[PDB]
């Protein structure tokens, strides 16, 4: 069987800003070579036969970058399939377009477009194939990790991954990240599901070369909520009672594999490529066929291109790469840095862990430490730079202007920190509260009567209260809403004005709640208790009695039975306003 692979050449995280606003993050040079060429060289060193490159943002630039490469030649053993569409914006969307196109056949590879690796995974591929052959397509994904230390500068705190796997058959049981977590919690069902062996691993750097079955594309077409890889694994590990699909794991201890996510991963992977940690993928080896990147390797990992014309007094002590045509002046001191092709360096300059790309121009007396200089840049004289300073796409830094530690300059104002120029200067209680909140939401959002009645029925089914108790709670909420409409007026006019439109709008829910004569008597008793609790607006207590007979809430016979039934409530109902309302109801009835 052939070995297929998919390559997500568009990282959908907004991390390389505003670096990815000009050229994408898969076209940035580590050491004069884009990460697309590194990942494709890793794929041909693996032994794949056909790839599927997926790129959405600036995909024409990626296409014109990789068509002139070694992998688009007809003599290449590993062909590529450029697929261009601006519709997808997620890795799950990429995999569901793979499922809709039906490109892969069996056991295809999954890789991002910014993964630097040299691992031969034929052993892991045969392990995944035998695990699929014995257990009858139960194993679906084989994640790959590298043995690393938690204190290593490669893995940062934003991308640290802690897993909990099995010891004898290396299947993954738990998988999470440490993004702002001082204490980690692991589930308890992993021990009951596997009583043979379990091990928690924090020494695993993620390389995102997780080979997998074509069933992950089916699972991505089923679950549309799975956006990327990690939430897909976190949802597959918790949904084990249905569609089990155990994920296995492979570890690498003698080969290198990582990716980039920010400036820290970029700096660490660049320092590892310069220090030959990803051998055979080496800058002087020239794995891609290009005359502008041919190099030679001296001692102390010094990489020298053609036509440098090095000056007197310049010191290159450790981990220095020089591009083709890079002009270097006198009395320089370069260490742990990569320089692009066609650059111009001044005099009495220091370069400490910097990353200079093609076309830059550094004047004399400049102090640059741990920075990143992008294409066609210009740097004037008498300037001191601090660590973690980024300048993208021809940013000129004026003389006698030092930058702070956190400082990113570009041509876009709101994405970067600034823009530069030739000058750098510019029980029943909870149910009652839920019913009151539902009534407040229906009054604020102007909900209909049917949805309000459905929400009231859902709250009555959830609280499991009786019908008369739910009617009394609804009457208490309707009496408390007009009592909460006024803060401390202590008057009947504002309470009547708040209770008239509330009873006029919510008349259908009050008719659906209070329907029988016993429900009408319970509503009359709740109205009497609310008038006893709100006696300061008691002059409106008859005004509600003329309202419930007007909106067909309380009938005239029920009102007569409530007035005839007697105490404090009988003395409150024997007022002049209640007697006048009863006389008006008897005159209007007949």
């Amino acid at each position: 069987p052939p070995l297929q692979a998919v390559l997500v050449a568009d990282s959908f995280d907004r991390r390389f800003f505003p670096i990815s606003k000009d050229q994408p993050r898969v076209l940035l040079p580590l050491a004069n070579v884009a990460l697309i060429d590194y990942t494709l060289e890793f794929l041909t060193a693996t032994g794949v036969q056909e790839t599927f490159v997926f790129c959405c943002w600036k995909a024409a630039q990626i296409k014109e970058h990789l068509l002139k490469s070694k992998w688009c030649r007809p003599t290449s053993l590993n062909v590529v399939r450029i697929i261009t569409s601006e519709l997808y914006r997620s890795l799950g969307d990429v995999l569901r377009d793979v499922d809709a196109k039906a490109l892969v056949r069996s056991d295809f590879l999954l890789v991002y477009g910014d993964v630097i690796s040299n691992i031969n995974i034929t052993r892991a591929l045969e392990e995944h194939r035998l695990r699929r052959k014995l257990e009858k397509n139960v194993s679906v994904m084989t994640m790959i990790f590298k043995e690393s230390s938690p204190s290593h500068p490669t893995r940062c705190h934003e991308d640290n991954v802690v897993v909990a796997v099995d010891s004898t058959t290396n299947r993954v049981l738990h998988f999470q990240k440490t993004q702002g977590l001082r204490r980690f919690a692991f589930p308890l069902s992993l021990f009951q599901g596997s009583s043979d062996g379990v091990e928690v691993r924090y020494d695993l750097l993620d390389c995102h070369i997780s080979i997998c079955s074509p069933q992950v594309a089916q699972l991505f077409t089923d679950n549309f909520d799975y956006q990327t890889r990690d939430d897909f694994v976190r949802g597959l590990l918790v949904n084990e009672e249905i569609l089990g699909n155990q994920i296995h794991m492979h570890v690498t201890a003698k080969e290198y594999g990582a990716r980039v996510s920010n400036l820290h991963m970029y700096s660490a992977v660049c320092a590892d490529v310069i220090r030959r940690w990803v051998y055979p993928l080496t800058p002087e080896a020239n794995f891609t066929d290009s005359t502008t990147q041919s190099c030679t390797h001296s001692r102390h990992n010094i990489y020298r291109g053609p036509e440098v014309s090095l000056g007197h007094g310049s010191i290159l002590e450790e981990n220095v790469l020089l591009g083709s045509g890079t002009v270097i002046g006198s009395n320089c001191f370069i260490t742990n840095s990569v320089i692009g092709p066609g650059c111009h360096i001044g005099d009495n300059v220091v370069l400490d862990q910097t990353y200079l790309w093609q076309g830059v121009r550094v004047a004399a007396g400049a102090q640059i430490h741990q920075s990143l200089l992008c294409d066609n840049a210009e740097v004037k004289e008498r300037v001191t730079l601090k660590p973690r300073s980024v300048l993208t796409s021809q940013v000129v830094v004026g003389p006698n202007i030092t930058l702070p530690e956190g400082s990113v300059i570009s041509l876009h104002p709101p994405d970067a920190e600034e823009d530069e120029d030739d000058g750098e200067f510019s029980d029943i209680k909870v149910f009652q509260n839920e019913v009151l909140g539902t009534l407040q939401k229906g009054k604020e959002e102007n909900i209909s009567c049917d949805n309000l009645v459905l929400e009231i029925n859902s709250l009555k089914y959830a609280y499991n209260i009786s019908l008369k108790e739910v009617m009394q709670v609804l009457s208490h909420v309707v009496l408390e809403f007009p009592l909460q409409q006024m803060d401390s007026p202590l008057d009947s006019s504002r309470y009547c004005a708040l209770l008239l439109p509330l009873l006029k709008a919510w008349s259908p829910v009050f008719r659906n709640y209070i329907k029988r004569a016993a429900d009408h008597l319970e509503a009359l008793a709740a109205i009497e208790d609310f008038f006893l609790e709100h006696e300061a607006l008691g002059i409106s207590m008859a005004k509600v009695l003329m309202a419930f007979y007007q909106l067909e809430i309380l009938a005239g016979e029920t009102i007569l039975s409530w007035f005839s039934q007697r105490d404090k409530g009988q003395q409150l109902r024997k007022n002049q306003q209640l007697q006048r309302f009863i006389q008006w109801l008897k005159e209007a009835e007949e």
Binding site: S85, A100, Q218, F224, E434, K460, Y461, A462, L467
Partner: protein
């Protein structure tokens, strides 16, 4: 054996000449994988077996089980297709999305306790709609079942305050429940004169591995008929069709027309096919175009259905405040449906078509959801909107489709 034929002009829902699929009956209760055993005890364990494959969408698809309820060498008049869905929220979203769905709701309640699963089932039955309460906790004590029947009678009093007037408290109780369902549930009115619309729910492949070159059957799809009558030999009309994005832009949906070669149900069905059951149609389609659950979500029309393939649908955003009857003892902001945020996935269940879509834009009563796959139901149908709360797709709201971006390639 049956004695059906291809000579029919205007059939009825209670016609005894077909005896394959007369009426449908929904089942939503507090089963927790207990309703399949009740459907096997009522109809049959290995009765529904036509074409099996790998379970792709278990919680999203609903299974239909036919039952020929006979009476008196017995005589069969009408058959009931019990629709069992994994999770009551999917069945509720399928029922509250139009008409002619879940005509006879069966409330499979438990006589053990009064937990919140029966309250959520009663809320789903109230949001869907003829109820049919049935206690499954057999083999109990006399006074214990009497107290459980008193608690179920209080729950049924609250039900009768909403919609609650069935009465039913191992084979004899199942036969009594079948007789009560045959005597109580009336025949629902179905439109047979309209065009046949077969919404696919589960597609299968009838071609075995290593088959002959001449004996090759492809495109044995299966779904549910909304309205009309489907006969063998009629040219079907796949409304979604093949959706291809090979033009480097908007995907074109080419409708693939295939003549219906046979209508193969769970039993030996005839040429004519009516609604209210798991209708399986084997047409003259390719095996690659109709793979295992690949042609799902496609409206297999018959006379050129008006519903076009919509990519972005602007509907009326109307979400509920809390969950329908789902509230535990804690309830620490669990039953609280949030607002429609930007770039959020939602499972719009337009009838039987459950398609995922991202919330591209929302203005205060109008949400424009961009669907992943092309859907073709109607221009103003009642579309639901669900959201996965905790590893389970639960309904969050409903709405009406106000506008849509249609596309029809050829």
């Amino acid at each position: 054996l049956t004695t059906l034929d291809v000579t029919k002009l205007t059939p009825l829902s209670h016609e005894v000449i077909s005896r394959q699929a007369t009426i449908n009956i929904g089942t939503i209760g507090h089963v927790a994988h207990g309703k399949s055993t009740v459907v096997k005890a009522i109809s049959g364990v290995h009765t529904v077996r036509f074409k099996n494959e790998l379970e792709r969408n278990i919680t999203i698809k609903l299974g239909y089980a036919n039952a020929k309820i006979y009476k008196l060498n017995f005589k069969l008049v009408r058959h009931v297709s019990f629709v069992d869905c994994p999770g009551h929220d999917i069945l509720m979203a399928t029922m509250l999305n139009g008409a002619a769905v879940m005509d006879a709701a069966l409330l499979l309640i438990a006589g053990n306790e009064s937990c919140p699963q029966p309250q959520t089932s009663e809320h789903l039955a109230a949001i869907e709609i003829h109820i049919l309460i049935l206690q499954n906790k057999i083999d109990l004590v006399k006074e214990s079942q009497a107290k459980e029947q008193y608690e179920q009678i209080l729950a049924f009093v609250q039900g009768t305050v909403a919609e609650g007037a069935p009465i039913i408290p191992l084979k004899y109780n199942i036969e009594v429940v079948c007789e009560y369902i045959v005597k109580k549930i009336p025949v629902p009115p179905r439109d047979f004169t309209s065009e046949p619309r077969l919404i696919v729910i589960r597609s299968f492949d009838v071609n075995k591995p290593g088959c002959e070159v001449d004996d090759l059957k492809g495109g044995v799809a299966g779904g549910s008929i909304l309205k009309g009558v489907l006969k063998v030999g009629q040219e079907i009309e796949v409304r979604p069709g093949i959706v291809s994005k090979a033009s480097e832009g908007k995907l074109m949906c080419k409708p693939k027309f295939s003549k219906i070669v046979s209508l193969f149900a769970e039993h030996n069905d005839l040429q004519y096919a009516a609604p209210g059951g798991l209708i399986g149609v084997g047409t003259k389609i390719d095996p690659t175009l109709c793979r295992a659950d690949r042609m799902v979500g496609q409206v297999l029309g018959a006379v050129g259905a008006l519903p076009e393939i919509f990519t972005e649908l602007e509907i009326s955003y109307f979400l509920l405040r809390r969950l329908l009857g789902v509230r535990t003892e804690g309830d620490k902001k669990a039953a609280k449906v949030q607002k429609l945020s930007k770039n959020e996935v939602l499972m719009v269940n337009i009838g039987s078509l459950s398609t995922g879509g991202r919330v591209s834009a929302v203005k205060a009563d109008l949400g424009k959801i961009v669907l992943t796959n092309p859907v073709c139901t109607e221009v103003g149908e009642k579309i639901a909107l669900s959201r996965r709360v905790e590893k389970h797709w639960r309904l969050i709201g409903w709405g009406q489709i106000r506008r849509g971006v249609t596309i029809k390639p050829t």
